């Protein structure tokens, strides 16, 4: 039983209400811990890799999307409303507002690349009949980011973007196929732009040494792309990760930068990219991927403290308290139920560790640590040894 809708109920992660907000998700405490941990995983790498998170508005005057050129095509699937007799809408994507920020920042070449990351809430007006769990939603957050760079920087930025994907997907336990899609018949921008960018893309792909397939003429109207199809442990494929070059928004927003239209000024290239895709969808994939057996650094339920008998409950609670104060996601079972009943019950919510506290542990001021994977032998640790162990199982890092 691995459907994410079922796991979201069984593991008390999230639920939907089809009468008050069909297509959006209610994330219970445990679900919200997973959601935020997935984003914080990405953020930890953002710091390592010089991405700068920004915060942008959610609602805009529809002039923004008339500027960006998205209005005619997206209006039908956007939530739109009048504000003082002007047409506004909820954002279905982040890119236009990032162009406004780039414009404001007004950088020179010495400050390129600029890498604006944004986890902002997005909305699309999906038909009610199409709605399905976390896979087809009206409300989602993306690990979205835009790299603004010189044409000469494309190769190195795309190579770093590929490395970033390889790191995250490998830590989530996915494999993946790479696809390069090149200039379609109808295309915005000059041929020299496309040739220069396609060579840099091809060059980055080659430098990884990984296999990759060419899809000639399947690029976007506004730029070539690399598509990444990932494969979960059920051997299903998902298109979550994207690297999409964009010659159009630089022109439409009149983006420019002084070098080493205007003279002496070139246009930046925009790289749209995402790794998780939508946190909502990646959450679903991972839950089905693992059957709900999440790794310690994603898990909402990291360690439960189980008292063998009432006599050790107070000591057992002090252990849970310190673990909570140290930032771990813990709970306790201090009922009069037998210790074996307490273990079986705690298998149900997939706790990564079970801390068994009996008289021997309270006497020697130690803890008995058991793993959800019962093939790993138990350990008798001091609280400080426990904390050191737990601390070594935070986010995997690309510099560690």
Euclidean distance between CA atoms 165 and 133, whole angstroms: 25
27 with 13: CB under 8 angstroms? yes
Burial label, 80 (beta-carbon count in 10 A; 0-12, 13-18, 19+)? middle
Could you tell which of a copy of itself, Ca ion, Zn ion, none binds residue 61, using a CB distance below 5 to 8 A set by kind? a copy of itself
Euclidean distance between CA atoms 357 and 363, whole angstroms: 10
Pairing relationship of beta strands 237-246 and 269-274 according to DSSP bridges: antiparallel
- 135 touches a copy of itself by CB under 8 A: no
Question: Which range touches a copy of itself (CB under 8 A), out of 125-133, 178-186, 200-208, 375-383?
Answer: 125-133
- 309 touches a copy of itself by CB under 8 A: no
Question: Which residues are tagged catalytic?
Answer: 95, 124, 142, 144, 146, 225, 272
Could you tell which of Ca ion, a copy of itself, Zn ion, none binds residue 267, using a CB distance below 5 to 8 A set by kind? none
In whole angstroms, the minimum distance from the beta carbon of 317 to a copy of itself comes to 13
Q: For a copy of itself, which residue of 61, 77, 150, 171 counts as binding (CB under 8 A)?
A: 61
Q: For a copy of itself, which residue of 104, 185, 235, 262 counts as binding (CB under 8 A)?
A: 104
In the three-class reduction of DSSP (H, G, I as helix; E, B as strand; rest coil), residue 96 is classed as helix
Strand partners, 270: 148, 246
Q: In angstroms, what CA-CA distances link 125 with 57, 91, 92, 129, 130?
A: 18, 11, 9, 11, 10
Confirm whether residue 227 is marked as ligand binding: no
In the three-class reduction of DSSP (H, G, I as helix; E, B as strand; rest coil), residue 349 is classed as coil
Confirm whether residue 98 is marked as ligand binding: no
Pick from 240, 248, 268: nearest CA to 256: 268
In whole angstroms, the minimum distance from the beta carbon of 90 to a copy of itself comes to 7
In whole angstroms, the minimum distance from the beta carbon of 21 to a copy of itself comes to 4
Could you tell which of Ca ion, a copy of itself, Zn ion, none binds residue 272, using a CB distance below 5 to 8 A set by kind? Zn ion
Q: How many CB atoms lie within 10 A of CB 265?
A: 13
Pick from 357, 396, 172, 161: nearest CA to 282: 172
Binding residues (CB under 5 A) for Ca ion: these are 36, 40
260 with 109: CB under 8 angstroms? yes
Widest pairwise Cα distance in the chain: 81
Could you tell which of a copy of itself, Zn ion, Ca ion, none binds residue 40, using a CB distance below 5 to 8 A set by kind? Ca ion
In whole angstroms, the minimum distance from the beta carbon of 284 to Zn ion comes to 22
- What does the buried/exposed string (b/e) look like for 101-126 if buried means 16 or more CB atoms within 10 Å of the residue's CB? bbeeeeeebeebbbbbbbbbebbbbb
In whole angstroms, the minimum distance from the beta carbon of 311 to a copy of itself comes to 21
In whole angstroms, the minimum distance from the beta carbon of 124 to a copy of itself comes to 11
Question: Which range touches a copy of itself (CB under 8 A), out of 124-132, 156-164, 174-182, 219-227?
Answer: 124-132
Cβ-based nearer residue to a copy of itself, 93 or 230: 93
- 79 touches a copy of itself by CB under 8 A: yes
Euclidean distance between CA atoms 37 and 287, whole angstroms: 14
Confirm whether residue 70 is marked as ligand binding: no
Question: Which range touches a copy of itself (CB under 8 A), out of 18-26, 207-215, 233-241, 350-358?
Answer: 18-26
Euclidean distance between CA atoms 39 and 143, whole angstroms: 7
Confirm whether residue 104 is marked as ligand binding: no
Pairing relationship of beta strands 114-118 and 52-53 according to DSSP bridges: parallel
- 55 touches a copy of itself by CB under 8 A: yes
- Tokens at 104, concatenated: 């404001």
Q: Which residue has the tokens 């950088």?
A: 107
Could you tell which of a copy of itself, Ca ion, Zn ion, none binds residue 348, using a CB distance below 5 to 8 A set by kind? none
Binding residues (CB under 5 A) for Zn ion: these are 95, 272
- Binding positions for a copy of itself, rule: CB under 8 A: 15, 17, 19-21, 24-29, 31-33, 35-36, 47-48, 52-61, 63-64, 67, 79-81, 83-84, 88, 90, 97, 100-101, 104-105, 116, 121, 123, 125, 127-128, 138-139, 324-325, 327, 399
Binding site listing for Ca(2+): 40
């Amino acid at each position: 039983k691995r459907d994410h809708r079922l796991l979201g109920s069984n593991l008390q992660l999230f639920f939907f209400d089809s009468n008050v907000s069909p297509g959006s998700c209610f994330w219970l405490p445990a679900g919200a811990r997973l959601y935020n941990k997935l984003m914080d995983f990405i953020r930890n790498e953002y710091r390592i890799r010089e991405f700068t998170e920004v915060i942008t508005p959610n609602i805009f005057s529809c002039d923004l999307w008339k500027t960006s050129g998205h209005y005619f095509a997206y209006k039908e699937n956007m939530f739109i409303f009048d504000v003082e007799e002007k047409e506004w809408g909820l954002k279905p994507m982040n890119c236009p507002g990032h162009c406004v920020m780039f414009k404001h920042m007004n950088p020179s070449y010495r400050q390129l690349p600029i890498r604006l990351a944004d986890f902002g809430v997005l909305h699309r007006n999906e038909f009610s009949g199409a709605l399905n769990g976390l896979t087809r939603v009206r409300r989602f957050q993306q690990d979205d980011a835009h790299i603004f760079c010189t044409p000469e920087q494309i190769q190195e930025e795309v190579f770093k973007a590929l490395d970033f994907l390889f790191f995250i997907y490998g830590q989530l336990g996915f494999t993946f196929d790479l696809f390069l899609s090149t200039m379609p018949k109808e295309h915005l921008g000059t041929e020299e732009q496309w040739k220069e960018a396609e060579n840099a893309l091809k060059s980055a792909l080659d430098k990884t040494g990984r296999d990759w397939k060419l899809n000639p003429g399947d690029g976007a109207f506004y730029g070539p792309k690399i598509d990444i199809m990932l494969w979960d442990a059920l051997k299903r494929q998902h298109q979550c990760g994207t690297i999409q070059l964009d010659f159009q928004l630089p022109i439409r927003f009149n983006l420019q930068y002084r070098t080493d239209l205007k003279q002496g000024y070139r246009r930046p290239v925009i790289i749209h990219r995402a790794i998780l895709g939508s946190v909502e969808r990646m959450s679903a994939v991972i839950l089905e991927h693992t059957g709900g057996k999440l790794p310690f650094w994603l898990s909402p339920r990291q360690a439960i403290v189980l008292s063998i008998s009432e006599k050790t409950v107070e000591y057992a609670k002090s252990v849970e308290r310190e673990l909570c104060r140290r930032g771990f996601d813990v709970s306790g079972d201090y009922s009069a139920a037998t210790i074996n009943k307490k273990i079986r019950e705690s298998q149900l919510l997939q706790w990564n560790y079970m801390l068994v506290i009996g008289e021997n542990e309270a006497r020697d001021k130690k803890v008995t640590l058991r793993c959800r994977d019962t093939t790993i032998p138990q350990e008798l640790l001091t609280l400080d040894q426990l904390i050191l162990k737990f601390s070594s199982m935070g986010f995997p890092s690309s510099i560690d």
